[model samples]
Target: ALRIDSHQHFWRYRAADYPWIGAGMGVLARDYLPDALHPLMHAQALGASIAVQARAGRDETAFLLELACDEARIAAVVGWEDLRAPQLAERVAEWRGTKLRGFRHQLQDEADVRAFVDDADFARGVAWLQANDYVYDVLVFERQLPDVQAFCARHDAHWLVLDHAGKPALAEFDRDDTALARWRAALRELAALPHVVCKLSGLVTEADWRRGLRASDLRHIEQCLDAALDAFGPQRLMFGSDWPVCLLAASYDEVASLVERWAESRLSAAERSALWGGTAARCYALP
Candidate 1:
């Protein structure tokens, strides 16, 4: 089976362009283009990768597409666009190609997460995407999972992928029983949707990144992974490195090894193949 890193990114970091990559973000504040990732992918023996949008701008999307054209390892890109634009359909139609597989908005940064997804105009835009065969990547916090659930219900036929397993609170999961229950319930509800898929990505960054992750720390992550596996199953679950972003907490190889270890232990060989690559290829229609 082909090994595909389902959710990585390529960016020419400009501080003004990406205000989110502030001082404390470490090396992520530097440029992370295809050249930086090429060796990492090669070292891991990954066949291809799906480059996801890190910033919300048409220029960033164009930059990624251009990189895809230049790098054969970058099989596809999930870009950003104004979903609420009046000419949303036309804009998406304008970018139709194998490299531009889907679109994503940084929903986690939006103030009104509920209103953003539930908004009438945004719904129309999503409808347009569905009608045109494009996927939507959901980037939201654990608190917004219910809103995501509602959004998925509203567009049941649309291909919606939940980025970062809804970014569950690892530190809070053990201490806060109420939040844990709510998160698990929300994940199950979202997973109940046939068209929804979950990425086993971004968890390393969500965990306590300031400290080294020991065996005990890994066990906590495993609990969260167990919840996802039970909810999404192998067919609906896919692996993603979240790449340079994951550098905040762990190295690329560390993140890959973590997922590989979990999948190897829990999943059958065929199921592991689906998690590692098949699910991504099917979701994004990768060539």
Candidate 2:
């Protein structure tokens, strides 16, 4: 079976301002595109990949879609859009012929969680996505999981994907029990929604940037993998590299290997195939 990288990114500074990757993440300050990823995908036996937007603008989606028009490797594109826009459905309809598979917002960067997910305008925007047959990507950290859960429950019919396992506390795991419990409980509840899918990506960055991770340190990672599998099954779970961000802990090869290792016994070959590519096809409505 051909492999598929369900999640990854390609950016051009000329396209938009990546404010998040400033002095802090100096490594990612440069351009990342299909040329850089093709070799890694080929080495990993990947047939096609989904390019997710890393920037916070509609043009990011347009860029990927335009690339998809010529690049067969990019099976789909999850672009950024103002989910709170009242004319969201109209905007989505405009891309009916393009390769726009889904949409995501950088809500994890928001200071007010309630305002981000529960805002009347935001909820209406989400409803518009549902009406327009677009998948909604839920990007959040531990502090934002509760609001995420509520949003998922409210829009149970919409296809919602939880980015980075809702971003658990990699920095505070040792010192924060309440936070972990809250995240897990909310995860269980969120999983109860069949329309929801979870992306098994982004944990490495969650790790203590100060102390590097060891092979044995995959415990927290495994815990999350098992919980997602148990709650949503392999069919609803998709694998994502979170790419350069993954450079925080390991290389692209290692990121793919770790996911393979974590799912070794828990998932069947077909299920594994789906996690690696099939579910992404379904979510992104890949052609």
The candidate that achieves the highest lDDT relative to the unseen native structure? 1
List the global CA lDDT of all models. 0.86, 0.80
Q: List the residue pairs that clash in candidate 2.
A: none
Clashes of each: 0, 0
- Model 2 / residue 180 / CA error / Å: 3.7
Q: How far out, in Å, is residue 1 in model 2?
A: 3.8
Predicted candidate 2 versus true structure: per-residue lDDT over 1-287, tens digit per residue: 55678778887754238767654566676778778888888888888887888888778788888888888888777888887787777777778867777788888888887777889988888787787777888888777787677778888766899898888785666665665677788888888888999899888878775478854457767777887788788899888888877876778998889888877778888898888888878777776
With candidate 1 superimposed using the best TM-score fit, by how many Å does residue 1's alpha carbon deviate from the native?
1.4
lDDT (tens digit, per residue) of candidate 1 on 1-287:
87899999877777888887876686788888887888888887888999998888898888888888888888889998998888877766757765898899998888888888888889888888887778899999998887767888888666799999988887665565675677889999999998999999999877777675556568877877889999998898889999989998889999989988998899999999999899999988888
